[PDB]
């Protein structure tokens, strides 16, 4: 349940080949207010697609 040799910096950084953060790579621009949001999310000012869905 323990190692017998120290794994290298090559193997240590090579296990971290798949541990990289993937981006959103695209946002969506709301037609009413030109700010950008996530796909299928509120535009952080209270707008979905075409109505101000949040009064606050």
């Amino acid at each position: 349940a323990v190692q017998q040799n120290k794994p290298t910096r090559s193997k240590r950084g090579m296990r971290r080949s798949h541990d990289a953060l993937t981006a959103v790579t695209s946002l969506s621009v709301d037609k009413t207010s030109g700010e950008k949001h996530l796909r299928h999310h509120i535009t952080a000012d209270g707008y979905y697609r075409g109505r101000k869905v949040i009064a606050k």
């Binding site: 299928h40 999310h41 509120i42 952080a44 979905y48 869905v53 949040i54 009064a55």
Partner: protein, 120 residues
């Protein structure tokens, strides 16, 4: 494995799930708007809108059934007085899930769940 199975146990027991859902249905019927997590919102509508379609027929038996659920007479009074006839013409879909940003304390997919009301 699970096949053809419904209901998300929400990392909590059956009694707590029922109590959460009674409290959440009362909060939705009271305030017309709830910010909660996405699976909580989906199961919330799956247990709220049965009450609204129970509430179209105003009878003492249906008040007692709608009081066996959610356990609040203000909620049954609202659900049979103002809701009910406001949603009489609709056939399902008394709720709308709008997703918002993730929670600050934990990465939770949060969602505004609300009815199909108007402001005035």
């Amino acid at each position: 494995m699970r096949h053809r199975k419904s209901g998300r146990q929400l990392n909590r027991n059956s009694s707590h799930r029922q109590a959460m859902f009674r409290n959440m249905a009362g909060s939705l019927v009271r305030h017309e708007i709830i910010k909660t997590t996405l699976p909580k919102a989906k199961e919330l509508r799956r247990v709220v809108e049965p009450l609204i379609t129970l509430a179209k027929t105003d009878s003492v038996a249906n008040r007692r059934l709608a009081f066996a659920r959610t356990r609040d007479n203000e909620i049954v009074a609202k659900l049979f007085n103002e809701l009910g006839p406001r949603f009489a013409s609709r056939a399902g879909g008394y709720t709308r899930i709008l997703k918002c940003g993730f929670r600050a304390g934990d990465n939770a997919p949060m969602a505004y769940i609300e009815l199909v009301d108007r402001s005035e």
